[PDB]
Design a protein around this ligand. Structure first.
Ligand SMILES: CC(C)C[C@H](C(=O)NCc1ccc(Cl)c(Cl)c1)N1CC[C@@H](CCc2ccccc2)N2C[C@H](N)C[C@H]2C1=O
Ligand SMILES: CC(C)C[C@H](C(=O)NCc1ccc(Cl)c(Cl)c1)N1CC[C@@H](CCc2ccccc2)N2C[C@H](N)C[C@H]2C1=O
Ligand SMILES: [K+]
Ligand SMILES: [K+]
Lengths: 211, 212
């Protein structure tokens, strides 16, 4: 029954129409799959590993983004429609599973403040498609829980500024935040990995944000 | 029968075990889908569009990479195995089609020197899975042919970039670094590039497999 060491860490981030109290919809997602050997056996800001699998997608949310969401993320439902983006459908979930199936198991999703935002919204989106157990293979970790354990604001920018004395590029974009998260997790890569291996939680224990 | 204007330009690049004369196998691929409005209505080097779909994957090739291929791409079959990479299989073909199905049609693949490398290698890999017609719906353009026509001299990705932005592009000879540099080059005269693509896009079914 216990999984043993996580073989892949899938660094994850999403943008939405708003915050959880508004019942948000995904507008953007980024998945960055990194094998555990890139963290246990790595070769001021560490370079990302040469071998990674990346997936960044924009999603039509079916409703307006709050004006706050648009200012911070640079996305709006109207601009997403101008770009011919499709909604969060069966093909999108099939795409996500196909990408994850290319990674050796056990898989662990890693998201900054993932337990309150990215993980329940991903669960809510899948549940709305009648696929409530689609990603139940996966494990998940909140990198805030992880980085507090390894050591005040625990925001992505604050943690980044304290370790590498600079602001990260392309902030508040799903891909930019995933790349910033990776660099933060590469600060003490063996320590971060041991914690993940011991505290990875089954994705099925994540309740959907709504519905 | 006329497809009309291309709605998406999918900037494409691949790394392989070696050059065509060795019957190579894909080791890495990058797809960057840009809606046509990003080039027809844009807002030194131009920034990439805010809204893009990107897929970058590494692939277990089934055989050794040539020492030349490893020196240039930074990839080897042993290192791909240590990172637990899967081969080009049915799941990889469904992943590519699901990614392309998120893009409005007509789709057009854009690869630098694509006719000789990227496009026949992709057809060869799809044919080896018994999926010869999998991407017949798509169109393709070789950006070397497009940029020669736009400038009408070395026409390598590096040389074009240096002639346009007076600097060398970062992460050269990685599928993503090269897709991004090509995107920058195509954003130089985006309206003229888009007008040419619309007039000379060719159906992907006209691309024969490199081998097989
Ligand atoms: C106390 C702060 C520091 C919370 C911070 C935040 O408010 N930042 C500004 C902002 C960004 C985007 C939008 Cl849209 C807005 Cl309005 C405001 N947040 C919430 C937003 C979500 C992104 C949107 C979202 C909402 C619900 C579910 C999934 C995703 N991020 C994802 C990250 N991994 C963890 C979280 C975060 O840091
Ligand atoms: C005459 C020159 C200028 C060709 C140039 C080249 O020799 N560069 C060095 C090199 C890179 C990688 C490897 Cl592996 C080696 Cl050994 C050598 N090439 C071929 C390599 C392929 C990359 C691998 C490949 C091989 C067969 C089919 C698909 C892809 N590229 C992809 C690009 N879109 C167009 C082409 C390119 O410019
Ligand atoms: K974010
Ligand atoms: K290349």
């Amino acid at each position: 029954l216990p999984p043993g060491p996580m073989q892949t860490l899938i660094f994850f981030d999403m943008e939405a129409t708003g915050l959880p109290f508004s019942q948000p919809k995904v507008t953007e997602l980024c998945l960055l799959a990194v094998h555990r050997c890139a963290l246990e056996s790595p070769p001021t800001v560490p370079p990302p590993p040469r071998v990674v699998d990346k997936l960044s997608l924009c999603v039509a949310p079916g409703k307006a983004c709050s004006p706050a969401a648009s200012e911070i993320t640079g996305l709006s439902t109207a601009v997403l429609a101008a770009h011919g983006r499709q909604c969060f459908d069966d093909n999108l979930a099939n795409l996500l599973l196909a990408f994850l199936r290319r990674q050796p198991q056990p898989w662990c999703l890693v998201a900054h403040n993932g337990d309150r935002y990215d993980f329940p919204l991903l669960q809510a989106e899948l549940a709305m498609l009648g696929l409530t157990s689609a990603l139940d293979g996966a494990f998940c970790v909140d990198s805030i829980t992880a980085l507090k354990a390894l050591e005040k604001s625990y925001s992505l920018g604050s943690i980044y500024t304290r370790l590498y004395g600079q602001s990260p590029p392309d902030s508040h974009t799903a891909e930019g935040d995933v790349l910033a998260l990776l660099s933060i997790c590469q600060w003490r890569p063996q320590a971060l990995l041991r914690w993940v291996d011991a505290h990875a939680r089954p994705f099925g224990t994540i309740r959907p944000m709504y519905g």
